Design a protein around this ligand. Structure first.
Ligand SMILES: *[C@@H]1O[C@H](CO)[C@@H](O)[C@H](O)[C@H]1NC(C)=O
Lengths: 49, 48
């Protein structure tokens, strides 16, 4: 996503990103959730099992 | 005496502080270990 490389599972979520917010971060600044740059929708990033 | 111990355990939350401190210390160690991934350590970024 816009050069942010990672491995995980993209699922539909309910985390209301603010309109100026593009990336979400965890405690250890791992990418928790992203907004898709094409369609303005919200997705979690859960790393694979 | 058994009833008094029951009332004391129901009323005082600091009676089991000897176990609560162990659980809290484990939580602090785990949280510190997680949060140490956010440090740059002199590099350009903390994200691999
Ligand atoms: C990507 O394409 C959709 C139409 O499929 C369009 O609505 C959207 O605005 C485009 N993304 C950007 C950033 O313009």
């Amino acid at each position: 996503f816009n050069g942010l490389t990672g491995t995980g599972v993209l699922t539909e979520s309910n985390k209301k990103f603010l309109p100026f917010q593009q990336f979400g971060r965890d405690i250890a600044d791992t990418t928790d959730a992203v907004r898709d740059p094409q369609t303005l929708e919200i997705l979690d990033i859960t790393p694979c099992s | 005496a058994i009833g008094k111990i029951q009332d004391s355990l129901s009323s005082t939350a600091s009676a089991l502080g000897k176990l609560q401190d162990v659980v809290n210390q484990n939580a602090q160690a785990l949280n510190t270990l997680v949060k140490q991934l956010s440090s740059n350590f002199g590099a350009i970024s903390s994200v691999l």
